[PDB]
């Protein structure tokens, strides 16, 4: 658990394009493009067409509020 | 219990009740502590008990 | 691309060369084998796999011929690494060549020279040795530094290593000859 | 022939295995051990082991 | 209980007359380092097998003698009386 | 205990009571404890032999070991009378008998093989029980079926006697290695029996591996051997409604599950949870249906025949008969839902019992009764083995050749004594054959045995005087050709240095054999040999890129369990000082999926005889997952 | 309770299991600072000081 | 057979293989034609074998009397000179009847032809051809073992009969040392009688193939006293041979040992091997530089005490400062250096940060350059230590192994002693334990354990010894940070 290693400033690396501000798991009987399971930013089963790896990381915005 | 009485190998006077067994053990404590663990005389084989 | 096999004594062949069972070579060099069958017979890779699957079941001369050609005609030979665990000594892992492929399906023992045994520290008591083939010619060259020939020299002394010298049966024959 | 002689010698060995030890599994009785285990229940006044 | 892992029809010593010190309630344990218990004792002669044991767990299991006589009326005790006479 | 003064030899003199498994070992006083404990281990590891023989040098307790080891023979326990015989298969059948005293009705079962565990099993000599017909009395101690270990007079044998010579054969007999004659290897033959379960559900069908287009047979028949090591293969279907896959019967694919074994199937037991009418419509079930019907036909047949006895008020039935009857009745009864592993299963589960004659092959381990070990390095023709020339024993060939170097180091001298005794016995046999009347032959025999074992001599004199002249001649011919029994008791009654010395001094004609191409004269004498369970097949592993337990479930021909590379292995490889190549091998063979795909693709698309692989530099999938999760954790590596 | 078949083994859940004898101490077994007699319920132990 | 053979004429001829073939064929055909005769006495029996007949071998004009068998052995082992077409000087000829010398001849072949891969290939072909012929000798001459062989000798040689039937005196005055003395006296005689008589076991005894002294004497003469489960020698000895039989009492003592061997192997399973990874980590990066002289001062050169003959052996192929001059290779054979502290260039003190020089490492530079030097050191130390620990459990013998570990893996001796004292303690620990390693490999391990307090790599050329601090193997890895 407790390790001494470099910390990361999330705000600089944060990407607005892959922002999950929609909480709906499904939208109108479909996986939400803004949902957690989003084919656009995270990828899908057809991963070779996506050219988007597991390294793809989503973001959530708490602005205008801060957490520890 | 009756099974330990049957297995035990001393005069029946010493196996009548728990008191007789304790008396027998205490009177022969020094001798009994000095007995070989591996001597087959002090051991047995069992099959159905377990 | 790994294997485990029992060791049996081999006579009449060079120290570095070994004899590998029919089943052992087929699996490790399967993709190389499928390449030749596809080229020779002009068939699809899936169809070539069907030929390989049929050969696995029992000894057939045709698949043996493809296997024999690979050991004969491959550049640098067909070579692998043989380790006896624990790998605690120099010579525990050795770079060796596949001289022959056995024609008995039942025979599943690797054939090694008695001189190699002392370096490996293993015994022909039913112990199993791990076989890891090396494919790239560059990788083959780098692992050739682990070959038995390079280990003829003892690294601490610079002298010849008795591990690769004549053993019990071998010494007696030369002794009767000379003494 | 040879086989008849071999059987004859085997029967005349004079060193014979203890059949009772080999077959003691059959001649051991479960009831002997079951009875005390059941009588441990007799500590309860209502329960009496028949 | 023990599965019949036998590869043979020979059963007199592999299964019929086999004994094990190890048990559910066993004085014998690997952690206890019962090296003495794994060894042989002079009483074993005529009752237990001196050379019959398994290399994996030496002394834990062995073969009973075919000629072993367990005294009648002693409840499968090797001897009618214990080691020390007490008389 | 420390005290060994309690042990007094006079107390244990003349008694083998202190011996257990070593009662099967001759001259056990001369063998070390280590070799004896190895022998005790080998006897349990010994495998059944089709052509097992009583040992030429015997301890005389062997027959008792055969008697009290009941797994090998079936003996009647009372006088019985055969009520009827019912057949399930040609190989498997049941015999119903009635006790001539109790009147109780019991049954005896006949099958070709006995399954013990894994592949281990043995075939049965079912001659007597097969001879029995209805209204035939079975006497009290008759042996209905016997193992190959027991002979006509129920003598017990766990090995074969093979002529052995200690000779250095082209260094092939190095350390504990053996060279065997092909004929001799024929003698050391084992059985393998396997019970294999193939489960076919509703969506699974069995391919027509053994059948043509007109007749659909997807698995072997009761009298037919397995071909290409494939019993059957099942193809699972997403929906079996279409039945469009009828044309697909001949072809095979990787997805199909193949079941592997070799041998003759001897019994099929099918447990079906599907109604008969549903099965009948499809032709692909045809073969299965037959055996299903056969099972029912067998079960019904017992039910009709025994219903009066079992369901009658008297009920003089053995528990075995009662339970057999109840199981068959359950089979014929409707609403019988079969459960395996406490769950109801779709389709049917089939158990095949397969018996194969497994011959001796290279890598097999064979031993003697004295703790020595040997591995079959080479099997060679009889002519290539040492053959003595220009003697009365001319053309005698050695069946096995053993390493001469280090023999005394083993501390098991007794093997040599066995060899010497059978070798000297060869001379005695030739002496009997060469000249004399029957009386001269018995005189030579009795003198030699008096030199070896007095008890055997006395008992042989009694046995011989009992024999009629024709029987005596037959016994003498048996001794001349087949061999001579010699008794070497484990501790008391064996011969020693002085006794063998006297034997050699008296028999001056007995001297080493001069072999055809061998300068050194050799001794060839029979040694008793046993076959051990170990074969190379147990530890064989071979893997090619795409435990699974499929091999244990008979779905794979051989284990594909990967070899493991560790820090020790990496260090020994790092001796080369070319770390990049080691990392390339690790990534291409295991860690890196992209590099692994490149290696496979290049191996199949490159030149067959020249292989050069170029691997891309990319982070592994594990590394990618690690970076993604760590960034979410809030910590990032700085390539510290 | 399992039933003996052929006088030396049991058949349960389709498998052949053989019962083997166990070697145990009869009674009054020695232990560190103690002498114990084993009973079905509670062992009777004598501890010394 | 011809009676005159010119060595370098056949070796430099293009009929080299054909000459060997026909001689090899002639020798084995002779052996198949005739039997070997045994007299079982000191006056050996006569045999007409070509291998034992004499030929004259001409080496650069000098004739040596050599047996036909020694000739075919010489040709097989002189394959290098046919391949390279360079003649064989008389310096290279060796005793062909003592197989111990073959090892040293291969060593001289490696030095003469430059430790090349080509000479490495030829030696492999020589070992191969020598072995294949041995099988032909063995399958034609034959080799056997028999108790009649023992009986046949004793019938002529009374001493064999008396030793084959020997039984200890029943004096209670005999003790474990007295019995063990009789064991060697009668066994040394037995081996001598077998070497000096025409018996079927003579070639075994002289060759050393398949002969272990203790186990040979137990079968033939006497077993002796045996330990119990916990090592105490049992008061009663076994006064028989396995060939003659054993007593019921003796049978229990043997079973005790065989059981003890089994229990010991169960305990032997322990194999921590933690140090192997630690030593490998520090030494994997150490490399070599093609620089003849790094530049170091003689006081900065390492000083070692040649107290024992074992000490000089560890420093072969390395430099030494002679009293008259400087920088001459130490000759291990000269016992003059025994008892003298000597100054040696050490891989510990090599100045260049990149690698160790050719004078500090030693003459093994060109020999071991292809492999990783640090990894060579870790395996030369690990494989004995791991094996010695296990072999000692069977028998103060175990103590050297522990102190070796404590020296490098703990700061007990590291924090209060100098490197000159540290390396000499290491060679003392190796000598007592029996580990045979050349000191260069042990010093390389100490070199990486040694971390400079001053933190300057090239300061070694300064006459003043650099300030430094040795570290524990695990701590030195931790100090990198
Ligand atoms: Zn330097």
Author numbering:
A (entry chain d): 1 to 68
B (entry chain c): 299 to 348
C (entry chain d): 248 to 426
D (entry chain c): 1 to 50
E (entry chain c): 398 to 484
F (entry chain C): 1 to 546, 556 to 649
G (entry chain c): 101 to 149
H (entry chain D): 1 to 395, 511 to 596
Please give me the paper's original passages concerning this structure.
Here, we explain the mechanism by which the phage AR9 non-virion RNAP (nvRNAP), a bacterial RNAP homolog, recognizes the −10 element of its deoxyuridine-containing promoter in the template strand. The catalytically active AR9 nvRNAP core enzyme consists of four proteins that, when pairwise concatenated, show about 20% sequence identity and cover the entire lengths of the universally conserved β and β′ subunits of bacterial RNAPs. Promoter-specific transcription is performed by a five-subunit holoenzyme that, in addition to the nvRNAP core, contains the product of AR9 gene 226 (gp226).
The electron density in all datasets was poor and displayed a large amount of disorder, which complicated the process of atomic model building. The X-ray structure of the core will be referred to as AR9 nvRNAP-core-Xray. The TLID carries a negative charge on its DNA-facing surface. Out of 10 independent copies of the AR9 nvRNAP core belonging to two different crystal forms of AR9 nvRNAP-core-Xray datasets (Standard and Large unit cell crystals), the TLID is ordered in only one molecule.
